Amino acid sequence: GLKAAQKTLFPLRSIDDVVRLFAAELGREEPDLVLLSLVLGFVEHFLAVNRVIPTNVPELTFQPSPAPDGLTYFPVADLSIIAALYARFTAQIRGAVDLSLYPREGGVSSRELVKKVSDVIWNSLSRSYFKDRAHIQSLFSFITGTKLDSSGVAFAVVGACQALGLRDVHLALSEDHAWVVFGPNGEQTAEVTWHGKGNEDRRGQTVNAGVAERSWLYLKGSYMRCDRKMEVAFMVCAINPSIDLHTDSLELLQLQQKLLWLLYDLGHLERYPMALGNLADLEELEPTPGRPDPLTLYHKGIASAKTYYRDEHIYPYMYLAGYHCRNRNVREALQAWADTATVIQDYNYCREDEEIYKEFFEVANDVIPNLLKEAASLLEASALQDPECFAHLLRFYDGICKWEEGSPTPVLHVGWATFLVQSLGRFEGQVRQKVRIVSGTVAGTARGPVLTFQSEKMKGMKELLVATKINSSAIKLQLTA
Ligand SMILES: *CCC(=O)N1C[C@@H]2C[C@H]1CN2S(=O)(=O)c1ccc(N2CC(CN3CCC([C@@](CN4CCC4)(c4cccc(F)c4)[C@H]4CCC[C@@H]4NC(=O)OC)CC3)(OC)C2)cc1
């Protein structure tokens, strides 16, 4: 329910008023995910979904304030609007789940209870809507339009469990999928949403098969297990400032940035690598005085992945590579992509890993070829003269090759082979042969660049990659075999 400590912070007439609600809620023993999700969804609806201020609606008002280059109008989050939305969600869940039929074995939720709550959210959703549609992530979307995206369903099941008083059910997250963790010690797992366009319904099952398979989608078991404070962080990361494909809401960007600094200062981003990359992206768009630089924050994201997730995360390095690409730091961008491939090499490319395959396919066959083409234009009256860039390029392909090893389906096809030959060809023979590709001589220690290939394909190509005249057919045949 909604208590006086929560209600007295209403109405929310500004960005700072919303931040104050979150600061107060994060200080409570059990932060209300439902209330916080509804507020974000309410403000996102008028700032990005439908910006046209309503004429025939009398209770709904907007708050004017000076905009940095006339006025800007903020949707006033009234207590009557939010409390009614909150009451509707609570009434729906409590009315559909009869907790007398489920024996709570000393504050522990059974699989049967978790599956019922999952079924309630699932059966409430609209029969037909676009899944990749923007702004269908919040509980406002579930209540006002019965639409939720893939990870939104997972968050809604967790929100609904908290409303029923189930403190043991928590959000589990990978870098592209969401499920729930429950039971004593939070070692019990259950699928609550779908994944992919048409990849069937594994709802109600454990994630064991996906973890044992070594797919990037289940991160070999080193996935995030959220506490209530991390579920608030997920919800803040989930804020979508997009108005259309090319424009953003300046208020939603400012709100997400302020909310991320709030979570950071309380230490709730310490185990959330992608939130730190998101904050760094926001800091580059609008730096806030006295705060650390985007580069410091990207490396804080990588450090978190290394410390708490045994360096098995892809996107922290991807975020850093993104920064260097935008700023045209060819060496530093290629280094970060090679570091991404060093992570993916110990995974097996499975059917449902399309999201990360598409990301690597685009860097290897569009982004990197575009970078080296632009660099070649600049040489006609520098990075292509650096043998370190060439070593980063080879380590990147080494990672993709090793990733393909032990995989049920191939990664590299004729489409990749062309861009490898073209990218190798962007570096002169003299620059390419400066790189020493060694296996090592002695193991351990007693009391031009150097590179070691972990993959069979790049090892067999060793001499060809360094030869003055590139044998295209042989390099293409070995990469695609
Ligand atoms: C020169 C620059 C250039 O051309 N390019 C091309 C691209 C961009 C730039 C550099 N390259 S790149 O190196 O190939 C590259 C860099 C960075 C990224 N991205 C990070 C990104 C995606 N995040 C991953 C997490 C999601 C998540 C939604 N997913 C997307 C499909 C569904 C999600 C997270 C976890 C579990 C999930 F099930 C889903 C959302 C759901 C709600 C919260 C969550 N987001 C966060 O946690 O945010 C921190 C989206 C964010 O960020 C934009 C793209 C890719 C390539």
Curated annotation (Swiss-Prot):
GO CC terms in record: chromatin; chromosome, telomeric region; cleavage furrow; cytoplasm; cytosol; endoplasmic reticulum lumen; histone methyltransferase complex; MLL1 complex
Annotated phenotype, changing Y319A: Reduced interaction with KMT2A
Consequence recorded when altering G301D: Found in isolated hyperparathyroidism; likely pathogenic
InterPro entries registered for this protein in UniProt: Menin
Effect of A391P: In MEN1; also found in isolated hyperparathyroidism
Primary location class: nucleus
One biological process term in Gene Ontology: osteoblast development
Region listing for Interaction with FANCD2, in residue ranges: 210-381
Subunit field text: Component of the MLL-HCF complex, at least composed of KMT2A/MLL1, MEN1, ASH2L, RBBP5, DPY30, WDR5, HCFC1 and HCFC2. Component of the menin-associated histone methyltransferase complex, at least composed of KMT2B/MLL4, MEN1, ASH2L, RBBP5, DPY30 and WDR5. Interacts with POLR2B. Interacts with POLR2A phosphorylated at 'Ser-5', but not with the unphosphorylated, nor 'Ser-2' phosphorylated POLR2A forms. Interacts with FANCD2 and DBF4. Interacts with JUND (via MBM motif); inhibits the interaction of JUND with MAPK10 and the phosphorylation of JUND by MAP kinases MAPK8 and MAPK10.
Known disease link: Familial multiple endocrine neoplasia type I: Autosomal dominant disorder characterized by tumors of the parathyroid glands, gastro-intestinal endocrine tissue, the anterior pituitary and other tissues. Cutaneous lesions and nervous-tissue tumors can exist. Prognosis in MEN1 patients is related to hormonal hypersecretion by tumors, such as hypergastrinemia causing severe peptic ulcer disease (Zollinger-Ellison syndrome, ZES), primary hyperparathyroidism, and acute forms of hyperinsulinemia. MEN1 inactivating mutations are responsible for hyperfunctioning of the parathyroid glands and subsequent primary hyperparathyroidism. Primary hyperparathyroidism can occur in isolation or in association with multiple endocrine neoplasia.
Name of the protein: Menin
Lineage, broadest ranks: Eukaryota, Metazoa, Chordata, Craniata, Vertebrata
Originating gene: MEN1
